[PDB]
Design a protein around this ligand. Structure first.
Ligand SMILES: OC[C@H]1O[C@@H](O[C@@H]2[C@@H](O)[C@H](O)O[C@H](CO)[C@H]2O)[C@H](O)[C@@H](O)[C@@H]1O
Ligand SMILES: OC[C@H]1O[C@@H](O[C@@H]2[C@@H](O)[C@H](O)O[C@H](CO)[C@H]2O)[C@H](O)[C@@H](O)[C@@H]1O
Ligand SMILES: OC[C@H]1O[C@@H](O)[C@H](O)[C@@H](O)[C@@H]1O
Ligand SMILES: OC[C@H]1O[C@@H](O)[C@H](O)[C@@H](O)[C@@H]1O
Length: 362
């Protein structure tokens, strides 16, 4: 009885009414730039899944301005090539989705330039593989930058003309990730890798399990399945998603609600506020891939029910409607960080995460 399409549109309208900067073609310049990339993904994915085009003009504006050489990383020469590889990876994946929505080769070309830029910081000398996140420093190979890269090459393996070298890169990247140790004993992914002071060998740094690091990897494996038709990639994704859904692992509350590890102590920073929606969108991708790979009508039904359950809780306990004024008649919905906890304030990363959950149920 809940209309996820209308709620996503209200959530996007709330996102624009409070956080979109027309003069900058960006959401919230006081927030991390990469989260504007995530927001762009959610808006593109809303249009892709709902069949609507109401934000297409706005998305094109954002792309055209955020394409330009970044003032804080001119040496990237624009096209979203930034001072960290994960920043680049978020926009690169948004361009994959833009290409999926529009069929405009221009966006596919951006993702291709991004893949080649990110790969510059893949090294086999440390950790036997993987890329660094901090381009200027080269001190950290983490989960998210390698999950983004892996989903990027796996996506390009299904879309780019030289799809073979991208499929080989994806298969090689997944083999490295699987062997990295970052996937722990309960099939959840810790934050990144530490390096042995004496031996130089790398190991799971046991930093927190963040929801978005259980998400991007699902989309990556889904694209690897589409590229190979090997259901082993789906089964591996399902083991990771199942671990998230199991309340015994602390990511899913006793009410069945996705919960970031920082929500308990009310310490979720500007980055962590956006994590849950990224997982939700990728989980919906996994659900679609699972239901299409088997003739069982109940295939992937647990993931849909999970997303549905999480939507209603967010719908009921985390929502606050904007009240219009005599000057601003904007209507929409605002959302806080906890999908079960109360609504206290809204921020752009919280709102972006909100849209992702609604879009995940379209
Ligand atoms: O990355 C998001 C934000 O980055 C800001 O640039 C930062 C530089 O000012 C600083 O010198 O180094 C960090 C390293 O990441 C840069 O991110 C932008 O000014 C912001 O607009 C952006 O939201
Ligand atoms: O929130 C967890 C994530 O934190 C990331 O480190 C941040 C950098 O990306 C950012 O640019 O600078 C701040 C400095 O406080 C860092 O918190 C990790 O790179 C991620 O792996 C981690 O999930
Ligand atoms: O694996 C631990 C890593 O933690 C990160 O937060 C730091 O930025 C890296 O320098 C460090 O190597
Ligand atoms: O992709 C997942 C979505 O697929 C749609 O076909 C269903 O109607 C939604 O309920 C579900 O959340």
């Amino acid at each position: 009885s809940l209309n996820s399409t209308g709620l996503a549109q209200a959530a996007i309208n709330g996102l624009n009414a409070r956080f979109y900067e027309s003069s900058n073609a960006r959401w919230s310049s006081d927030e991390p730039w990469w989260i504007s990339g995530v927001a762009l993904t959610m808006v593109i994915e809303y249009m892709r899944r709902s069949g609507s085009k109401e934000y297409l003009d706005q998305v094109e504006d954002v792309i055209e301005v955020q394409r330009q050489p970044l003032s804080w990383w001119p040496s990237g020469e624009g096209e979203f090539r930034a001072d960290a590889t994960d920043d680049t990876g978020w926009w690169a994946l948004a361009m994959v989705r833009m290409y999926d929505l529009t069929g405009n080769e221009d966006y596919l070309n951006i993702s291709i330039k991004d893949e080649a830029y990110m790969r510059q910081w893949w090294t086999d000398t440390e950790c036997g593989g993987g890329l660094y996140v901090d381009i200027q420093d080269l001190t950290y190979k983490n989960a998210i930058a390698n999950e983004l890269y892996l989903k990027l090459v796996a996506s390009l393996a299904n879309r780019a003309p030289n799809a073979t070298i991208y499929l080989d890169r994806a298969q090689q990247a997944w083999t490295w990730f699987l062997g990295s140790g970052m996937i722990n004993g309960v099939n959840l992914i810790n934050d990144g890798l530490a390096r042995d002071s004496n031996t130089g060998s790398c190991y799971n740094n046991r930093l927190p399990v963040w929801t978005y690091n259980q998400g991007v990897i699902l989309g990556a494996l889904v694209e690897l399945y589409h590229a190979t038709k090997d259901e082993s990639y789906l089964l591996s994704a399902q083991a990771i998603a199942d671990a998230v859904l199991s309340p015994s692992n602390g990511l899913t509350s006793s009410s069945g609600v996705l919960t970031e590890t920082c929500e308990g102590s009310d310490s979720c920073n500007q980055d962590q506020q956006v994590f849950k929606g990224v997982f939700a969108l990728n989980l919906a991708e996994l659900g679609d891939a699972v239901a299409g790979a088997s003739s069982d009508p109940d295939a992937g039904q647990d993931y849909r029910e999970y997303l549905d359950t999480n939507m209603q809780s967010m719908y009921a306990n985390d929502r606050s409607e904007i009240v219009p004024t005599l000057f601003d008649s904007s209507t929409g919905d605002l959302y806080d960080v906890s999908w079960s906890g109360p609504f206290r304030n809204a921020t752009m990363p919280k709102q972006a995460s909100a849209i992702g959950l609604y879009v995940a149920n379209i």
